[PDB]
Design a protein around this motif. Structure first.
Motif, mmCIF file in Angstrom:
data_model
loop_
_atom_site.group_PDB
_atom_site.id
_atom_site.type_symbol
_atom_site.label_atom_id
_atom_site.label_comp_id
_atom_site.label_asym_id
_atom_site.label_seq_id
_atom_site.Cartn_x
_atom_site.Cartn_y
_atom_site.Cartn_z
ATOM 1 N N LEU A 1 0.850 -1.173 0.000
ATOM 2 C CA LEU A 1 0.000 0.000 0.000
ATOM 3 C C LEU A 1 0.904 1.247 0.000
ATOM 4 C CD1 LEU A 1 -2.750 1.267 0.341
ATOM 5 C CD2 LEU A 1 -2.581 0.823 2.786
ATOM 6 N N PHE A 2 1.032 1.850 -1.188
ATOM 7 C CA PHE A 2 1.765 3.134 -1.266
ATOM 8 C C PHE A 2 0.722 4.263 -1.349
ATOM 9 C CE2 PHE A 2 5.917 1.367 -1.676
ATOM 10 C CZ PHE A 2 5.799 0.174 -2.402
ATOM 11 N N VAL A 3 1.199 5.452 -1.089
ATOM 12 C CA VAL A 3 0.415 6.649 -1.358
ATOM 13 C C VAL A 3 1.315 7.656 -2.061
ATOM 14 C CG1 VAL A 3 -1.228 6.354 0.506
ATOM 15 C CG2 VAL A 3 0.882 7.690 0.944
ATOM 16 N N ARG A 4 0.673 8.550 -2.806
ATOM 17 C CA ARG A 4 1.377 9.690 -3.418
ATOM 18 C C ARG A 4 0.538 10.950 -3.220
ATOM 19 N NH1 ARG A 4 3.314 8.363 -9.463
ATOM 20 N NH2 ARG A 4 4.613 10.205 -9.032
ATOM 21 N N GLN A 5 1.226 12.068 -3.066
ATOM 22 C CA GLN A 5 0.519 13.371 -2.957
ATOM 23 C C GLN A 5 1.526 14.428 -3.363
ATOM 24 O OE1 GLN A 5 0.284 13.889 1.561
ATOM 25 N NE2 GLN A 5 1.422 12.006 1.106
ATOM 26 N N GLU B 1 5.413 6.982 -1.338
ATOM 27 C CA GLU B 1 5.493 6.878 0.111
ATOM 28 C C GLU B 1 4.625 5.712 0.576
ATOM 29 O OE1 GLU B 1 5.069 10.674 2.138
ATOM 30 O OE2 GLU B 1 5.251 11.770 0.248
ATOM 31 N N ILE B 2 4.693 5.375 1.856
ATOM 32 C CA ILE B 2 3.661 4.534 2.458
ATOM 33 C C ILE B 2 2.815 5.434 3.335
ATOM 34 C CG2 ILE B 2 4.838 2.324 2.174
ATOM 35 C CD1 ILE B 2 5.882 2.621 5.096
ATOM 36 N N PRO B 3 1.620 5.002 3.745
ATOM 37 C CA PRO B 3 0.779 5.887 4.565
ATOM 38 C C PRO B 3 1.525 6.340 5.792
ATOM 39 C CG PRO B 3 -0.513 4.054 3.737
ATOM 40 C CD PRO B 3 0.960 3.712 3.458
ATOM 41 N N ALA B 4 1.496 7.639 6.032
ATOM 42 C CA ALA B 4 2.362 8.227 7.082
ATOM 43 C C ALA B 4 1.690 9.512 7.529
ATOM 44 C CB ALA B 4 3.737 8.505 6.508
ATOM 45 N N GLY B 5 1.994 9.884 8.760
ATOM 46 C CA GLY B 5 1.469 11.171 9.234
ATOM 47 C C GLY B 5 2.152 11.558 10.527
ATOM 48 N N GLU C 1 -5.985 8.151 5.285
ATOM 49 C CA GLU C 1 -5.367 8.254 3.975
ATOM 50 C C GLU C 1 -5.847 7.199 3.019
ATOM 51 O OE1 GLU C 1 -1.116 8.839 4.246
ATOM 52 O OE2 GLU C 1 -1.479 10.804 5.121
ATOM 53 N N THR C 2 -6.306 6.054 3.537
ATOM 54 C CA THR C 2 -6.614 4.941 2.646
ATOM 55 C C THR C 2 -7.975 4.332 2.959
ATOM 56 O OG1 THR C 2 -5.627 3.124 3.939
ATOM 57 C CG2 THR C 2 -4.134 4.429 2.539
ATOM 58 N N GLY C 3 -8.647 4.668 4.037
ATOM 59 C CA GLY C 3 -9.940 4.078 4.336
ATOM 60 C C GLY C 3 -9.854 2.724 4.980
ATOM 61 N N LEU C 4 -8.681 2.279 5.418
ATOM 62 C CA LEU C 4 -8.478 0.927 5.890
ATOM 63 C C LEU C 4 -8.146 0.896 7.381
ATOM 64 C CD1 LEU C 4 -6.219 -0.376 3.010
ATOM 65 C CD2 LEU C 4 -8.717 -0.560 3.232
ATOM 66 N N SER C 5 -8.431 -0.272 7.961
ATOM 67 C CA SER C 5 -7.965 -0.542 9.317
ATOM 68 C C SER C 5 -7.287 -1.899 9.238
ATOM 69 C CB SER C 5 -9.077 -0.539 10.343
ATOM 70 O OG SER C 5 -9.912 -1.651 10.044
ATOM 71 N N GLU D 1 -9.177 13.409 -0.613
ATOM 72 C CA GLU D 1 -8.835 12.952 -1.955
ATOM 73 C C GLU D 1 -7.491 13.480 -2.449
ATOM 74 N N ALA D 2 -6.803 14.371 -1.742
ATOM 75 C CA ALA D 2 -5.480 14.823 -2.147
ATOM 76 C C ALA D 2 -4.398 13.750 -2.046
ATOM 77 C CB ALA D 2 -5.155 16.023 -1.258
ATOM 78 N N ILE D 3 -4.775 12.576 -1.511
ATOM 79 C CA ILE D 3 -3.776 11.502 -1.423
ATOM 80 C C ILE D 3 -4.236 10.407 -2.342
ATOM 81 C CG2 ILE D 3 -2.746 9.837 0.154
ATOM 82 C CD1 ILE D 3 -3.353 12.150 2.372
ATOM 83 N N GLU D 4 -3.381 9.995 -3.227
ATOM 84 C CA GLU D 4 -3.639 8.912 -4.170
ATOM 85 C C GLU D 4 -3.187 7.587 -3.561
ATOM 86 O OE1 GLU D 4 -1.036 9.085 -7.551
ATOM 87 O OE2 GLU D 4 -1.984 7.458 -8.519
ATOM 88 N N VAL D 5 -4.108 6.604 -3.508
ATOM 89 C CA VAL D 5 -3.776 5.259 -3.051
ATOM 90 C C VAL D 5 -3.193 4.492 -4.214
ATOM 91 C CG1 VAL D 5 -4.721 3.082 -2.274
ATOM 92 C CG2 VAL D 5 -5.499 5.197 -1.194
ATOM 93 N N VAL D 6 -1.983 3.971 -4.012
ATOM 94 C CA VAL D 6 -1.244 3.278 -5.063
ATOM 95 C C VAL D 6 -0.863 1.888 -4.578
ATOM 96 C CG1 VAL D 6 0.806 3.382 -6.526
ATOM 97 C CG2 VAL D 6 -0.347 5.494 -5.898
ATOM 98 N N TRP D 7 -1.714 0.892 -4.794
ATOM 99 C CA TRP D 7 -1.303 -0.472 -4.514
ATOM 100 C C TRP D 7 -0.345 -0.915 -5.610
ATOM 101 C CZ3 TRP D 7 -2.136 -3.215 -0.212
ATOM 102 C CH2 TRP D 7 -3.314 -2.984 0.585
ATOM 103 N N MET D 8 0.803 -1.435 -5.218
ATOM 104 C CA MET D 8 1.819 -1.805 -6.221
ATOM 105 C C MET D 8 2.726 -2.885 -5.663
ATOM 106 S SD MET D 8 4.706 0.576 -8.099
ATOM 107 C CE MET D 8 3.469 1.777 -8.615
#
Ligand SMILES: Nc1ncnc2c1ncn2[C@@H]1O[C@H](COP(=O)(O)OP(=O)(O)OC[C@H]2O[C@H](O)[C@H](O)[C@@H]2O)[C@@H](O)[C@H]1O
Ligand SMILES: Nc1ncnc2c1ncn2[C@@H]1O[C@H](COP(=O)(O)OP(=O)(O)OC[C@H]2O[C@H](O)[C@H](O)[C@@H]2O)[C@@H](O)[C@H]1O
Ligand SMILES: [Mn+2]
Ligand SMILES: [Mn+2]
Ligand SMILES: [Mn+2]
Ligand SMILES: [Mn+2]
Ligand SMILES: [Mn+2]
Ligand SMILES: [Mn+2]
Lengths: 154, 154
Positions: A39-43, A54-58, A77-81, A115-122
């Motif tokens: 699970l990556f993210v981009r913004q 990146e990976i989900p981070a804050g 950031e991703t809607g997941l738990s 929505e400013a964070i793009e979820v990028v599964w890769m």
């Protein structure tokens, strides 16, 4: 004895003798694998003028501990738990800042919200290949996630 | 359009709208393995008030490219030279700084010379165990070296 030149929203700038020091809130990051994809993210990141992988981070917020911040960031950031396990921590660049990142693994992920964070599964193999060919940049958290997978999750 | 609040020796502090941005010179780091030990270094880091486990690392100086900076830092910090291969790069914390780190592998190390930096040869397995037990902190470069070894050098 620090002298403060700037007190901000997510950092302070101090001098300590000859040293320039950036105080910064601690951070968390979450490594998550599902069906071989990480699970990556981009913004957009104004500091670098691009969107690194990146990976989900804050940042940890007042009153939170790292585990709670990690749960929050993953959800926001991703809607997941998931089931989170602490892995390790690192100072992002201890020659000038005190920012510390606490890294967690998440398993058994479930959607808890669509929505400013793009979820990028890769696949991490593909993230590393795109990087080696110059097609994407990494943050430290993204690179740590890819290396951790290759070390321990295959 | 950045507004500059501080122009320093190894960083500048700017505002770009609501964003606080630290401009910083790019860095290099060198992963080196010998007889199962990785080459770590430690030094007091005023920003964090302790000496984390790092790998040899430094800033790129004017006129240098990353490979040359890596060779220099390895020699200045540890007295060694080696055959260097570029591995990957990362932004240390792209939510606030543009600092980018270029990471190299060094092989076939030789002493080219016989003090504020402590050379710490240590098995990466042991570095990870000491960290998990709370006995040492990592920088990002130290953690990247340990994870890279476990992924690709065993
Ligand atoms: N905060 C500071 N402010 C002022 N000058 C400094 C500071 N820190 C060191 N110096 C001076 O600048 C010189 C820097 O020494 P080099 O070996 O090229 O760099 P590195 O190892 O510090 O940083 C390499 C990376 O590792 C860490 O993650 C860092 O955050 C970087 O990301 C020192 O000799 C001091 O004279
Ligand atoms: N440079 C900035 N200055 C001002 N405010 C900011 C900045 N960047 C974002 N914000 C605001 O602060 C909030 C921060 O959003 P969160 O998800 O908790 O943190 P993260 O993902 O940014 O940083 C996590 C780590 O990942 C990276 O490596 C970073 O450098 C950190 O090390 C934003 O919504 C903005 O409102
Ligand atoms: Mn974030
Ligand atoms: Mn967030
Ligand atoms: Mn989104
Ligand atoms: Mn150094
Ligand atoms: Mn140096
Ligand atoms: Mn020394």
């Amino acid at each position: 004895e620090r002298t403060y030149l700037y007190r901000g929203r997510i950092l302070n700038l101090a001098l300590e003798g000859r040293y320039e020091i950036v105080e910064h809130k601690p951070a968390v990051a979450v490594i998550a694998l599902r069906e071989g994809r990480m699970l990556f993210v981009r913004q957009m990141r104004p500091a670098v003028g691009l969107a690194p992988l990146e990976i989900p981070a804050g940042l940890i917020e007042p009153g939170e501990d790292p585990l709670e911040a990690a749960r929050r960031e993953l959800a926001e950031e991703t809607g997941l738990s998931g089931d989170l396990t602490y892995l390790f921590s690192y100072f992002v660049s201890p020659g000038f800042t005190d920012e510390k990142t606490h890294v967690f693994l998440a398993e058994n992920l479930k959607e808890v919200e669509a929505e400013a964070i793009e979820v990028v599964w890769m696949r991490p193999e593909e993230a590393l290949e795109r990087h080696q060919r110059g097609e994407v940049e990494f943050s430290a958290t993204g690179l740590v996630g890819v290396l951790y997978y290759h070390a321990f999750l295959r």
